[PDB]
Amino acid sequence: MNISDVAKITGLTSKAIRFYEEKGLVTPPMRSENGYRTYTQQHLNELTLLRQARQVGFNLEESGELVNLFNDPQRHSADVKRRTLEKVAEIERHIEELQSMRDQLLALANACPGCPIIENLS
Amino acid sequence: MNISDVAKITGLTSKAIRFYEEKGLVTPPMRSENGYRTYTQQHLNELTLLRQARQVGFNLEESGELVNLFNDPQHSADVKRRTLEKVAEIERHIEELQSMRDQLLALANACPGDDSADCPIIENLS
Numbered sequence: 001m002n003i004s005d006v007a008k009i010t011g012l013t014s015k016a017i018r019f020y021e022e023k024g025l026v027t028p029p030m031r032s033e034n035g036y037r038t039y040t041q042q043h044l045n046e047l048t049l050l051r052q053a054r055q056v057g058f059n060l061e062e063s064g065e066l067v068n069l070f071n072d073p074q075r076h077s078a079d080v081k082r083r084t085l086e087k088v089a090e091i092e093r094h095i096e097e098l099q100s101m102r103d104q105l106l107a108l109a110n111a112c113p114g115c116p117i118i119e120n121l122s
Numbered sequence: 123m124n125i126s127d128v129a130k131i132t133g134l135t136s137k138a139i140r141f142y143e144e145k146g147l148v149t150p151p152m153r154s155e156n157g158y159r160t161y162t163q164q165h166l167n168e169l170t171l172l173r174q175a176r177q178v179g180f181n182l183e184e185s186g187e188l189v190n191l192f193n194d195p196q197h198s199a200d201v202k203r204r205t206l207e208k209v210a211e212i213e214r215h216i217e218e219l220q221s222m223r224d225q226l227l228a229l230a231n232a233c234p235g236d237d238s239a240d241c242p243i244i245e246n247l248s
């Protein structure tokens with residue numbers, strides 16, 4: 001496949017695909033007799049993984065490590081699990097933060113008719 | 123007040139304060155006899171609103187619009203409206219993080235968590 005198809009299939013922008021290549025986070029694409037990029041199911045898997053890991057909160061470095069673990073035939077599922085539970089703790093904190101912001105906005109909204117909001121924000 | 127005083131009082135950097143002005147998000151300050159910016163309590167109020175609006179979820183334009191409403195002599199329900207949409211947006215964000223947490227905790231529970239290569243987490247993420 002060419003980069004365009006890989007994009008449509010993975011839900012990543014060509015920009016992003018080329019980016020992960022520049023960072024060395026995914027297996028480089030192959031070059032054809034013409035000098036253009038072609039990918040295989042293997043590249044599709046690595047990129048899919050990378051996309052979903054970013055979606056669930058993993059940053060770049062971590063996402064790359066997951067690709068490494070993915071390509072490691074002798075990976076320890078325990079290592080992946082520890083990383084996943086750590087990531088869960090972070091998501092929990094992130095949730096607590098957003099909840100704290102939501103309560104403050106709701107308080108401001110409560111004290112308002114149809115302006116405490118603006119007055120207290122400045 | 124000069125720009126440095128405003129920075130100390132609001133906690134914003136002088137670069138940030140110059141940025142807000144450059145983007146017309148706040149009222150431009152006047153000039154002193156020597157050509158330096160002079161601020162008034164109105165500037166402190168706009169910059170504070172802007173800093174707190176951002177800290178509580180609003181983006182730049184939304185913050186700029188909140189500042190425009192602030193300066194208006196007249197819109198209780200026009201702000202309560204914006205405020206409540208920002209809350210709906212946050213709740214949706216919370217809903218999404220919760221969903222990712224549960225999904226990761228489901229995969230982790232299915233994980234052997236041992237020295238074998240079989241891994242449901244890696245498998246259902248790639």
Ligand SMILES: [Au+]
Nearest residue numbers: 112115116117
């Ligand atoms: Au209000």
Ligand SMILES: [Au+]
Nearest residue numbers: 077233241242
């Ligand atoms: Au696992």
